Copies of this chain bind each other. A is one copy, B any other.
Amino acid sequence: SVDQIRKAQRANGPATVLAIGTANPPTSFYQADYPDFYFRVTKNQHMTELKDKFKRICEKTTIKKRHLYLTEDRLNQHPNLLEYMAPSLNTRQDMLVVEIPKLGKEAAMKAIKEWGQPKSRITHLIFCSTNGVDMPGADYECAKLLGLSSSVKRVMLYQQGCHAGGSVLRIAKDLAENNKGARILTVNSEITIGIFHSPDETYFDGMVGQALFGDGASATIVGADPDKEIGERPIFEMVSAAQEFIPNSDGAVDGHLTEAGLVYHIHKDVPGLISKNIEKSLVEASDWNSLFWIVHPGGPAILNAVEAKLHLKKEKMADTRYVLSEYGNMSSVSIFFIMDKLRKRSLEEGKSTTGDGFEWGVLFGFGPGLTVETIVLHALQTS
């Protein structure tokens, strides 16, 4: 009878995205003014040559705006954040354990409101955050703040990196497709409390990270067997979710949790390693310009290397480069912002499908490994 339960318990259709909600800390910092803010709060305005070096770094990110939790006052009250390598892991944990679930709940409510169904029908919760490891984790805190059922099956993804956007979706695919009537709440929340560092004396990776990473949170509802009779509208259908690590790049992008916070390292072979090894996962998963693209905006060098290797016209990266410009690199949250804009803009423009008129698409995540997450999406009609 266990094989009878197996069919009575599984869903039938592919996992579909039923709703998307986003959030960001209120304070926005314009990239053209961040270097002047960054060197002031650290009390390094006298380092003119280092300040103009950090300006040029921020100019070349193509980022125009970023939302950050760490305001000038928060840094003023926690001086250990402004010391280069002083022990500040505890003071970082103190803000992160509280704010990670809070910003996540903020984005989760927007997704739930759009979805429109009662919270009781949420059966799973996938919470993803790079920073703020705690026991119990943010998956429990967010479920507690949202008021979900005690029976919510939770998955807590800590310290994964920027690729975890595709990971969350790849996990939600199996949970939603394998369980009849399941409605998976995904929550990605990234706040740069754990990676903030002061100006550099041989740590410009932080400067490269200070100029690139921004704060934000995202949430989706993923479920199979969408039900229009109640008002469920599927946005995209997930067709396949793959993951591979770039063989020779264990140290290309690494992150080590220390007593002075998270110390990251991003080498300059990442664009070359991705571009040279991106076509493999694509052929396994066709004319590249006949697809819509949701690429993780890890940086403009990565975007150009991907855009050049696949011979994509600028049109394909518009949604991606818009998110990078208006929010920066938000780690695993970024691809949800891009997906959200693509589908809203397609629904607004009256396109033939939710994927900018195209029927097939590809979503990318890039992170430590180097890890590449590749998800094949199926756009759906606009009413």
Q: Known interface pairs A136-B369, A368-B140. Does A237 touch B2 (Cβ–Cβ under 8 Å)?
A: yes
In the bound complex, residues from chain B placing their C-beta under 8 Å from that of A93 are: 256-258
- Is A5 a contact of B135 with CB atoms below 8 Å? no
Q: Mark A153-176, 1 if CB is under 8 A from B, else 0.
A: 111111111000001001101110
A252's nearest neighbour on chain B, judged by CB, is: B136
Bound CA span A156–B368, Å: 12
A253 at interface, CB cutoff 8 A: yes
A255 at the interface (CB under 8 A from B): yes
Does the CB pair A90–B259 fall under 8 Å? yes
In the complex, whether A32 has a CB less than 8 A from a CB of chain B is no
Is there a chain B Cβ closer than 8 Å to A242's Cβ? yes
Q: Which residue of B lies closest to A14 (CB)?
A: B6
Q: Is A286 an interface position by the 8 A CB rule?
A: no
- Measured between beta carbons, the chain B residues less than 8 angstroms from A241 are 153
A348 close to B (CB within 8 Å): no
A10 to B179 alpha-carbon distance, docked (Å): 12
A5 and B140 contacting across the interface, CB-CB below 8 Å: no
Known: A6-B177, A158-B133, A159-B135. A140 touches B250 (CB 8 A): yes
What B residues does A220 contact at CB under 8 A?
none
Q: How far is the CB of A203 from chain B (nearest CB, A)?
A: 16
Q: Does A41 contact B (CB under 8 A)?
A: no
Given A161-B135, A255-B135, A257-B89, A239:B2 Cβ within 8 A:
yes
Considering only CB atoms, which chain B residue lies closest to A163 in the complex? B136
CA distance A170 to B171 in the complex (A): 12
Identity of the chain B residue whose Cβ is nearest the Cβ of A246 in the assembled complex: B150
Q: Do B135 and A256 touch across chains, with their CB atoms under 8 A apart? A: yes
A255 partner residues in chain B, CB cutoff 8 A: 134-136
CB-based nearest B residue for A153? B243
Write out the residue numbers on chain B whose beta carbons fall within 8 Å of the beta carbon of A201.
none
Residue interface bits A59-94, CB-to-B below 8 A is 1, else 0 = 000000000000000000000000000010110010
Interface-central residue, A6, A161, A240, A244, by most chain B CB under 10 Å: A6
Of B156, B170, B258, B367, the residue contacting A89 (CB under 8 A) is B258
Question: In the complex, what residues of B have CB within 8 A of residue A239's CB?
Answer: 2, 5
Complex Cα distance A156/B255, Å?
A: 15
A152 contacts the other chain (CB 8 A): yes
Contact: A371 with B136, CB < 8 Å?
yes
State the A residues within 8 Å of B (CB).
Answer: 2-3, 5-6, 9-10, 12-14, 87, 89-90, 93, 133-137, 140-141, 143-144, 150-161, 167, 170-171, 173-175, 177-179, 237, 239-247, 250, 253-259, 264, 280, 284, 367-369, 371, 378
List the 6 closest A-B pairs by CB distance, nearest first: A135-B255, A136-B368, A135-B368, A259-B259, A178-B178, A174-B178
Beyond A89-B89, A152-B244, A171-B171, list 6 extra A-B contacts (CB 8 Å): A10-B177, A87-B87, A93-B257, A151-B284, A153-B241, A155-B171
Q: Could you name 27 residue pairs across A and B whose Cβ atoms are closer than 8 Å?
A: A3-B12, A5-B14, A10-B177, A89-B89, A89-B258, A90-B258, A93-B257, A134-B256, A135-B159, A135-B160, A135-B253, A135-B254, A135-B256, A136-B161, A136-B250, A136-B367, A136-B369, A141-B250, A144-B250, A150-B247, A150-B280, A151-B284, A152-B243, A154-B243, A155-B157, A155-B171, A259-B259
